[PDB]
Amino acid sequence: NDNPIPKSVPLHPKSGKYFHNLHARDLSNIYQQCYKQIDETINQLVDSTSP
Amino acid sequence: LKDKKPFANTKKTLENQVEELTEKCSLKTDEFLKAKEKINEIFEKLNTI
Numbered sequence: 298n299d300n301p302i303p304k305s306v307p308l309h310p311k312s313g314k315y316f317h318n319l320h321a322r323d324l325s326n327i328y329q330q331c332y333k334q335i336d337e338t339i340n341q342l343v344d345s346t347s348p
Numbered sequence: 349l350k351d352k353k354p355f356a357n358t359k360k361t362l363e364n365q366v367e368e369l370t371e372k373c374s375l376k377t378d379e380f381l382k383a384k385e386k387i388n389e390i391f392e393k394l395n396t397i
Contacts, residue, residue, distance in 0.1 A: 301354055302361075322380070327387065334394055 308316065 301358055330391060334391060338394070
C-alpha cells in the first residue's frame with residue numbers, strides 16, 4: 298500500500314547465499330581460555346594462602 | 349510508465365538501506381575488535397599477575 302514496500306518477500310538464491318553466510322560468532326576459544334584461567338587461579342590459590 | 353518511477357524511488361531507498369548495512373557492519377566489527385582486545389588484555393593482565 299502507498300509506498301510499494303512489501304513487508305516481506307520469499308527467499309532468493311542470491312539472498313540464500315547471504316543466509317548461508319550468516320552465523321553466530323563463536324566464544325568456544327574465549328570460554329575455554331576463561332575456564333583454564335579460572336582453574337589455574339584456583340590451583341594457585343590452593344597453596345597460595347599462608348598456612 | 350507512470351508506475352515505473354516509484355520503483356526507481358524504492359530502488360534508491362533500498363540502496364540507502366544497503367549503505368546502512370555497510371555502516372552497521374562497520375560498527376559491529378569495531379565493537380567486536382574492541383571487546384576482543386579488552387578481554388585479551390584482561391587475560392594478559394591476569395597472566396602477568
